[PDB]
Design a protein around this ligand. Sequence first.
Ligand SMILES: [Mg+2]
Ligand SMILES: [Mg+2]
Ligand SMILES: [Mg+2]
Ligand SMILES: [Mg+2]
Ligand SMILES: [Mg+2]
Ligand SMILES: [Mg+2]
Ligand SMILES: [Mg+2]
Ligand SMILES: [Mg+2]
Ligand SMILES: [Mg+2]
Ligand SMILES: [Mg+2]
Ligand SMILES: [Mg+2]
Ligand SMILES: [Mg+2]
Ligand SMILES: [Mg+2]
Ligand SMILES: [Mg+2]
Ligand SMILES: [Mg+2]
Ligand SMILES: [Mg+2]
Ligand SMILES: [Mg+2]
Ligand SMILES: [Mg+2]
Ligand SMILES: [Mg+2]
Ligand SMILES: [Mg+2]
Lengths: 195, 109, 129, 153, 98
Amino acid sequence: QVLVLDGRGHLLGRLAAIVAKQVLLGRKVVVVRCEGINISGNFYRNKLKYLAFLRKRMNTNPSRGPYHFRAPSRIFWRTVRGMLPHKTKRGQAALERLKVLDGIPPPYDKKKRMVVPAALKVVRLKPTRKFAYLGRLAHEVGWKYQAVTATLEEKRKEKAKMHYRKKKQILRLRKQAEKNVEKKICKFTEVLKTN
Amino acid sequence: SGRLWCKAIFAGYKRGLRNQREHTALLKIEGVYARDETEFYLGKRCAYVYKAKNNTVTPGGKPNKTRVIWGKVTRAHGNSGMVRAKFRSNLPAKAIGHRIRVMLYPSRI
Amino acid sequence: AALRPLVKPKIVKKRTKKFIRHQSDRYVKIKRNWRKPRGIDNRVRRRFKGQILMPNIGYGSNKKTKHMLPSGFRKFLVHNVKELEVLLMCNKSYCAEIAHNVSSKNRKAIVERAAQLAIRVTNPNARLR
Amino acid sequence: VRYSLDPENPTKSCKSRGSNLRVHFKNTRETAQAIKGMHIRKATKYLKDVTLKKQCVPFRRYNGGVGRCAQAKQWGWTQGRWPKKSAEFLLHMLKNAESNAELKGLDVDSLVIEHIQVNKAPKMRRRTYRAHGRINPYMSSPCHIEMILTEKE
Amino acid sequence: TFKTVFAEHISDECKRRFYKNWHKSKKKAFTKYCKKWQDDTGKKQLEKDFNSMKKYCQVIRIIAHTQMRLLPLRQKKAHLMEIQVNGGTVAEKLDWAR
RNA sequence: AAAUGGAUGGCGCUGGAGCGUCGGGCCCAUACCCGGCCGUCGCCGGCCUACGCCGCGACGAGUAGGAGGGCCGCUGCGGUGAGCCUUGAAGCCUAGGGCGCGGGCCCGGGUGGAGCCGCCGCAGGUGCAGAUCUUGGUGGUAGUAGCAAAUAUUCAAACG
RNA sequence: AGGCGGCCGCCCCCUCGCCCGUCACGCACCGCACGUUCGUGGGGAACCUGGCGCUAAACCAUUCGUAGACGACCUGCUUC
Ligand SMILES: [Mg+2]
Ligand SMILES: [Mg+2]
Ligand SMILES: [Mg+2]
Ligand SMILES: [Mg+2]
Ligand SMILES: [Mg+2]
Ligand SMILES: [Mg+2]
Ligand SMILES: [Mg+2]
Ligand SMILES: [Mg+2]
Ligand SMILES: [Mg+2]
Ligand SMILES: [Mg+2]
Ligand SMILES: [Mg+2]
Ligand SMILES: [Mg+2]
Ligand SMILES: [Mg+2]
Ligand SMILES: [Mg+2]
Ligand SMILES: [Mg+2]
Ligand SMILES: [Mg+2]
Ligand SMILES: [Mg+2]
Ligand SMILES: [Mg+2]
Ligand SMILES: [Mg+2]
Ligand SMILES: [Mg+2]
């Protein structure tokens, strides 16, 4: 009943629009690994845009004003909130369906991740265009947990490597068993109706 | 046993930008994402099923907390497989983003 | 076992709500009765969207079902037994309604006469102990 | 006479009333709302402690510019006071309630204040001499009080 | 905060910190927690807690309290405070603390 | 290059969600077409309250202003209802039922305790949301400001 | 931001739990809806029964002043 969408390789707005449209329908969406979301344009251009956004702030009381977030997950959350009607009760109720998270936590490392090809940088941008990584962009402005994020990502990748090796061994054994039991299993129906 | 209806979500009523029409509702049925695929669901009955605190009589069995609003598919909507519907009574605004089961009672093929 | 009227169609109402006077909710000195707003810059007079509705001739109900009760009869007010026998020929479409100032002693006589004449009464078995 | 929220068991209930008595209606309302739903002994003890400033009466509805006390934490509120005149008036009313219960033959120990209502009274007037030779009203706010006592067990 | 392991015998001078009213209280703090150091099963549980901390925890801090008895003040309530240990290895910092 | 932080409407968009030329679909106005209902006008139809009863067609916005209808409402008078009422009049209240597009009205229930209303005409000191409107009453402010010009009170007892 | 899954040794037992064929039965409700599901769903007040364990802490009052406009905050009480 949930949609676990990977974050790496997807464009910021191209993915956020799809998530904002899918949340208003009722599907609970969880965007994992938000530090890999790419943004079109020059990295210095995106940095200048983010700094111009940071400059905007209430004069009389900055604490009671625009709350600028530094984590890339919170950046993506604010981007989706900018498209959702958050000032109405429908948008307020839909905002809990979206779960933006940095890294791949225990509740989501075992779940298979989905990829939306309509937001992938490979098909969205030309191979000669410049892009900026949201993780580096956030780390350059008031983000401190990039090192531990990368360390935990390395750990979970080294674990998933062994898991995939085990799965590949199981697949090899399955293919060997299929090739071994040739008799007693005709299954001409499977071939005539093509699996 | 097993489900005998298609799944559809209520996105909103038929509306422009600064006005709504509560008599006609829009449905996003799962599996249909094109205009050439919604011709099968034209005329199919639809049911918005919810629960209340006072049990009401049911056609089969003892009274239950279940209450259903009936309607049917009128025509298609757009090119993205969205469909239209008109119920006996207009859908409540709280049903936006919830499920209306599309039956297969009126069968043509 | 109520008295069956003549044939009756499904009465449809153009508007089921009663028209509310403008700004009658903010001030309790303003009665619920409708008054035509004649302001030079009022929203209701020029019919802005989202405002209250103004009653016009368009909301007029059908002449075939006008003044018809949900039971299917048309009420006629009576005071004594003399003004009850006049509804003898119109018992199938018109029905009787006893006045409010009629005493309980003279009300039961009207009820008995209506039951004898087979005339529908909108307020039967009223003010009984 | 006429009472609001008459008791369902008139044989196990006793009523008390005071009319046109000179206290502040607001302080009387606060102390009555604080004392409602309490046994007679506990109510007497609480009023005797309020008179000596041992535990505040929380001002919830009429609390404009009311200084906060430390003893109001028991009521989950921050603003409390010690209205002595209303305390002694409600004590005098509870005495008449106990007397009526004894006359009716009820158990005083099991009596609880299930209902107590206070409302405004006709205001008496005086005049105040202000600047530039102006006269302003100086009005009192007396209140009518009523209470019903019923045995809990 | 991953885990916290307290000592076996905690003096009342330090236990006074966990109470707002020391006179009305019954001094029942850490009565059942001290039984873990006496029970062999509790000792095994504390040892597995230490073993899990050695592997998972990265920043080690030590909780210490002052001795108001030696001071001329009449407070008698010790101030508990955490001090981060900046030793070489996380595995040896736990040994140095234990 | 301009002074509060900030405006392709915002989010955002770069194999386009930008610019130029275009194609096929799709979205909706009180606009158009079909149909129901209400009113006006025109043409009328019948020897069924003729001031009534039908039929067809076309049109309905509107300040200032001009007309027509009201079986909308208030008071009093002349007729009339063999009118209603101490087995309960007027008045007041009501999560009750219901009518009229509307002004308003009918009934049920609870108070109330002595008059009232329908129809046909007549005459008005006849309909209120305002006028720094008149009189009377009541709220927020608010148990707030304020009980501070001229040195100062304390102990014990009695009547209560 | 961890708790379900795998392995091995037994436990009350088990070779119609799977695919094809075969004789015979059952709410065959007489054309109809809200049917079938993670529901031993979440939350709150109690009722009858078994086994294992628990016997407090806050606020008020009082005191302190490292703090106080009032609240608040820093402190003490033991019969040695
Ligand atoms: Mg900072
Ligand atoms: Mg104008
Ligand atoms: Mg205020
Ligand atoms: Mg004050
Ligand atoms: Mg002040
Ligand atoms: Mg003077
Ligand atoms: Mg911009
Ligand atoms: Mg037109
Ligand atoms: Mg016009
Ligand atoms: Mg009249
Ligand atoms: Mg009476
Ligand atoms: Mg009299
Ligand atoms: Mg006048
Ligand atoms: Mg007025
Ligand atoms: Mg004025
Ligand atoms: Mg007067
Ligand atoms: Mg005033
Ligand atoms: Mg003051
Ligand atoms: Mg003076
Ligand atoms: Mg004396």
